[PDB]
Amino acid sequence: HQVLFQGFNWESWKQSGGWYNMMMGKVDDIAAAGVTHVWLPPPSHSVSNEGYMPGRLYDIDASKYGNAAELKSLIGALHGKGVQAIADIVINHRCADYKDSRGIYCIFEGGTSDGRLDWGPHMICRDDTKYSDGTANLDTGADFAAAPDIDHLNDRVQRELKEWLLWLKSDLGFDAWRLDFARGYSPEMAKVYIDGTSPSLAVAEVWDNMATGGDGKPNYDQDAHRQNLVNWVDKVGGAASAGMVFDFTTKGILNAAVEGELWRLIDPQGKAPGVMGWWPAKAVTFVDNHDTGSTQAMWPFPSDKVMQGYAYILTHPGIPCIFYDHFFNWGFKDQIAALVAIRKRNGITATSALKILMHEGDAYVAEIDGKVVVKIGSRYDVGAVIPAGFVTSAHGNDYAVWEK
Ligand SMILES: [Ca+2]
Ligand SMILES: [Ca+2]
Ligand SMILES: [Ca+2]
């Protein structure tokens, strides 16, 4: 059994009294709902309030989310209920605390009194010319415009970032990683960090744009999009590796499919159309995160159909990730916990078998491990496609589940 939970949103840093302190009062409900791992935000000093422009990686006390004591108390509470803590690891780029003789912020500070992570411009990808000194290797992935991109081919960078990651485990208690902006460096570089730190899992945010047609909707065929994700997993080490990816292919398809286009939820081979259909053991599915939803709203799930997204991901193969706001703020707590209970009760896991029974515009119905059937869509009647022996279980707005 494995169910992830994103334990923050884009406004969390503002929480009066501290976000981790507030989360202490949320631990029992998260664990009782069947969550096994909670993804926490970047914990270090950051030039931006939300944590995504880290500077002094060891300076946990500088975070807006709370200090190291408050973070360790929350991780200890999660562990007390048997739930793991996943740290948001932001290493594609990094802000430097000091200026060099050129007046450029390219002399870094790790946050410890010794030289750990106190890099210079030789550690900045040479092609990030706003900051580099032209001497490093070219970036192994995309650039993040607002800050120096780090040259992961540099041996000192690799060694000192692995030391820092191991310290997040040994000192703070983190168990696993979520790799931010993983399209910023190659999967071969991600492999150095994952293999060198043995996290229980490392879920990477590899977010490529989805191919769209002239009407603005994603294409029915997203094979190229999921092919890039499975190739990333192969390059990080495949089944041997602790690495896995967020299923952005399923997110993009599901965003469109629930708008009366549920025929999008099966490919021409009879499989789920996202990474779920090709390598479910490596696909972390989700309805929204702090970038797609929350107050950034870059690619929000249709608001009136969010429970159909959960009926889908919580009953299907792949590893589902529940978003904080949906569980605590939108009123879906009981419904989401009920769906996870159905998943756990029936022994459904990332590699459960999926048999799709109907895939029409207003009705998608699927059977998982021969034990659970789920329907989403506005169609009133799908009775004839429910196999014998199934009894109604949980239901809500445009979704229903049956158990056998
Ligand atoms: Ca230092
Ligand atoms: Ca950059
Ligand atoms: Ca980069």
Swiss-Prot record:
Function as written in the Swiss-Prot or TrEMBL entry: Alpha-amylase displaying a robust amylolytic activity toward p-nitrophenyl maltoheptaoside (BPNP-G7), amylopectin and beta-limit dextrin.
Location(s), subcellular: Secreted, Extracellular space
InterPro entries associated with the record: A-amylase_bs_C (IPR012850), A-amylase_pln (IPR013775), Alpha_amylase (IPR006046), Glyco_hydro_13_cat_dom (IPR006047), Glyco_hydro_b (IPR013780), Glycoside_hydrolase_SF (IPR017853)
UniProt-recorded name of the protein: Alpha-amylase type A isozyme
Cofactors named for this entry: Ca(2+)
One GO BP: starch catabolic process
GO CC annotation: extracellular region
Cofactor stoichiometry and binding remark: Binds 3 Ca(2+) ions per subunit.
Subunit annotation: Monomer.
Catalytic class of the enzyme: hydrolase
Keyword set includes Lyase: no
Chain residues that bind Ca(2+) 3: D128, D143, F144, A147, D149
Family per similarity comment: Belongs to the glycosyl hydrolase 13 family.
pH-activity profile: Optimum pH is 5.5 with p-nitrophenyl maltoheptaoside or amylopectin as substrate.
Alphabetically ordered keywords of this record: Calcium, Carbohydrate metabolism, Germination, Glycosidase, Hydrolase, Metal-binding, Secreted, Signal
